[PDB]
Design a protein around this ligand. Structure first.
Ligand code: ASP
Ligand code: NA
Ligand code: NA
Ligand code: NA
Lengths: 419, 411, 411
């Protein structure tokens, strides 16, 4: 006998690929019948969005309160240094692969500061209850006057920053704040058993979520018309995630880096089907501490921060497609335009959310930084549901690799705390 | 005390409503300021339903995880759920067929399941997902306003189940919500001391706005729907469920309970008639003492068959008073919230009014029309407690035949 | 330190504000990016007022349920509430009559009561009910945005009272909100370390936008309104309240406290001036040691008479700077929020700026205009602490005459 959690998800990917292809050649469902056929995939999607509010709140508090305010200054330093050391490698390796292959040549016909100051406006929200379901967005309009309104979507950057300060303040209070450690440890345990309930609906949900995604109109634009551009994203997403990211693991940890990737197979195949790193963050929590046995004092801090900051897969997809958009024109892309692409794609991957189809909101940032218009993104919208699933597996993998790398880099400081 | 000061609110509220309408002339504005002390009560009730739903669901389910004594504890909880769901379904069918108060359907059933699993817990406290088929058609959601009662009931049932299985690790969460449910049950008692002042100005606001004698024929047909439902459930349904599993003449079982039904009328409390209905089951119908010491204590605060049927009837009567038909996605929302109002009020007779506000807010009905339910509630509250103790009485005979192998082994 | 580093923030914000305006030319866009580090401080302050209101109200009211020593404990709490309410009313009348900053009435009082009892606790954290008379007229509510400070103060007062009466059952709720209030009082101290960097860029954003010399004539009339209110309250009001109940020449009582008032100017802290004003009341004014050991400890964190008057004046001065008149429903919202700011700041002199943001958010005033309050706050902060210990000094003499029968019986 073996495990039924992973073997039924693979059996649902197989039974979901062969279902969403066969119902196209056999029957002809309307646009309304293609929304009720993907309805069990919608219930799984909003069952995972439901659990990330008590999961991010309770893991960020008990992840930092378990560290004695100077160990957490070095876990925090070894996390941001790792996140900058992987985004920069994924941006540079995506830059070299897109200018040596040159996919965009001779197939020509076929508010950056306001978006970066909205990261700091979202780290310190005006209300904590409003931060649980609303984000802040800034538009510039009239010699112009800045005016912002509250859009929708959970402010993950503002609940991480407040609970990081709330986690540090609680741990320095001693016995006067011990009841707040016990409250958010019993809440982080109770909202991980709920994730084990959603994990039993997950094979039934993927089987209709991936059958209702490949049920679209034309398999020709993805295959041949926009071909060899997907062969520059997916090659870089392969080499960064198979070769480069288990080489950073193998240098500092001598413990077989593909044994770690096999133990994260449920979280990798979830983001490969649901295309959202924040929604599969509960799967990444369980599949790291239970399978790979990485210490709970680090995964509660590294994994929520990395889900909204470390987005290596977006950084490579930003660096490939923005050059490819510029390659459909006849721009030179000199030595000054290349480095500013690799710089602003690092900030756009930081400012991008873990929500689905968040790759094209921050694509306007990198495109307008080189001078391209914002309405040149309409060439990419055709194939974006497939390229948004392979760059989320890599995003989850990057976060997972960090937990193992920071733990060996701080095995002494974790062993410092004793009786 | 609280019955005498509510009947006094109705009598002083009817006499005020006819000495103001007949002896003065108010505009549309002064008739709004006259019903202002009742408007404060209607939003003091909606204020408290959010910590009442959350704390009573988590504590009631986590108490049932600790009270179940194997198979005897499980058969009593299963029996309490079916009779409550049958009494609600009997109440829904009777109020839809008779219709007192009068004179797509697939997108409403999928909105039912989308609201059980909301996308956020904080938006579930004040917003509901509603969908709209439009344009060969498209589908758009809107996230309209009003508290999502189904999303909070379903989450806190799953959350309350998880803390019960955690044991020692989650004992601080059981202790937190126990003190949270005791605190908000004391705020409900504070609101029920303001309630006779609020019902007075809110009954009198209705008497000003009437011109007919037809609203009293609708209130008379509402009492004749509840009393019909309480008669079918106590003579036709609950003796039949006894006779399906126990072939032992259920009406002879009911005459043996005759001392317990009369004292459920005088005291009018299902928990305060316990020490008479303990002995009246054992001295007369020869039921085992091991089943009676469990079924009747937990049944006087869980098995609410007359309350659930009454809440189901009263909410559709308000939804027929204001001219609606509820479709089918709102009728199931009545049938879950009225069934879960057994757990959602943690064994308190105070919360009979606020659980009606939970059922009216689960659909989106105007809560200011609950005074017509309250104005005739004192007539029917005596008869609800008689059905609430009859389902407890019939439970001792049903669980005994299902657990006859458990009574030769545990001794 | 914190006084020395805010005066340095105002001087280096004025020196930056006059070397940028006079030596450059910014557009409407660059004037918004220059004041961006002060805009982050203005939303770090609004971030913390929601757990500060909730935790300090629940813990402060439940502490007062445990601190009252029968009749001596009740007379001191009652005295602290009337003088604070008189100093606010004196501050409201003085800022309305003088008006520094210049050059229906029944729907605003009923919106006051509708907002004390909101229809939902989660929407009360970010939304406020507002009504609109329209059409022989009708009345419609809208639920506009902005945090309902009155709904959170009134609920957590009722909630904090209930946990105090629960005792052992609610002891986990007292310990939860005590650790929650100790935690958010430490986050407020973190924000006050960023505050000198934030006031620098937010003062300099104001100096760029000025073209007149009229904002400083209004700031001079604002300091001459607070100092007038502190002079009327300490010479005319508080000696009169002493003379009504104690016929013992209140200026001789004040001269016996002369050593405690002068050391309240040097240290400028009301809790750190306790061991001098203990002996200076007993060695000179012959106060009982049993009354002094209660009134002065609890009065240094509750009786804030000079701060409450100052908060009332500063919020209407901002509401006259931005051209409004507040009607009367917003003036009562000042008079409740500034009075309840004694409990809503758990005895800390750091939190003087963040309680002003609570008063400005209770009405809906722009919180970014609080830098003109801060730029002259260091001049007035010395004189607020002298009045804050004078109400403590006059409190020991007033309660002893009221409780002379409780001092012949406990011995
Ligand atoms: N859902 C995607 C968004 C993107 O980066 O395109 C992610 O979390 O990685
Ligand atoms: Na990275
Ligand atoms: Na990530
Ligand atoms: Na990001």
């Amino acid at each position: 006998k073996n495990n039924w959690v992973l073997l039924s998800t693979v059996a649902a990917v197989v039974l979901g690929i062969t279902t969403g292809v066969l119902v196209r050649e056999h029957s002809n469902l309307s646009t309304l019948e293609k929304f009720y056929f993907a309805f069990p995939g919608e219930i799984l999607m909003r069952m995972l969005k439901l659990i990330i509010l008590p999961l991010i709140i309770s893991s960020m508090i008990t992840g930092v309160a378990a560290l004695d305010s100077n160990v957490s200054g070095k876990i925090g330093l070894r996390a941001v240094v790792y996140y900058f050391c992987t985004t920069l490698i994924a941006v540079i390796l995506g830059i070299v692969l897109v200018v040596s292959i040159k996919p965009g040549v001779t197939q020509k016909v076929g508010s950056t500061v306001d978006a970066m100051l909205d990261l700091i406006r979202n780290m310190f929200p005006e209300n904590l209850v409003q931060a649980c379901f609303q984000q802040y967005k800034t538009k510039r309009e009239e010699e112009y006057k800045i005016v912002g309104m509250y859009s929708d979507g959970i402010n993950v950057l503002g609940l991480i920053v407040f609970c990081l300060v709330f986690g540090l303040v609680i741990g320095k209070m001693g016995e006067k704040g011990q009841i707040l450690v016990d409250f958010f440890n019993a809440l982080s345990d109770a909202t991980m058993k709920i994730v084990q309930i959603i994990m039993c609906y997950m094979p039934l949900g993927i089987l209709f979520l991936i059958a209702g995604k490949i049920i679209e109109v034309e398999d020709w634009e993805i295959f041949r018309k926009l071909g060899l551009y997907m062969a520059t994203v997916l090659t870089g997403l392969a080499i960064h995630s198979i070769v480069i990211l288990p080489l950073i693991y193998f240098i500092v940890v001598r413990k077989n880096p593909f044994r770690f990737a096999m133990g994260m197979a449920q979280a990798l195949l979830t983001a490969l089907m649901i295309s959202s790193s924040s929604a599969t963050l509960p799967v990444t929590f369980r599949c790291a501490e239970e399978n790979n046995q990485v210490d709970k004092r680090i995964t509660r801090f590294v994994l929520p921060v990395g889900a909204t900051i470390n987005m290596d897969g977006t950084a490579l997809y930003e660096a490939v497609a923005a050059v490819f958009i510029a390659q459909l024109n006849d721009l030179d892309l000199g030595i000054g335009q290349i480095i500013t692409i690799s710089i602003t794609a690092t900030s756009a991957s930081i400012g991008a959310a873990g929500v689905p189809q968040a790759g094209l909101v921050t694509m306007v940032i990198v495109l307008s930084a080189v001078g391209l218009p914002a309405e040149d993104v309409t060439l990419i919208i055709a194939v974006d549901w497939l390229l948004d699933r392979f760059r989320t597996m890599v995003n989850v993998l990057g976060d997972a690799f960090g937990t193992g790398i920071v733990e060996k880099l701080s095995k002494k400081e974790l062993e410092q705390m004793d009786v």
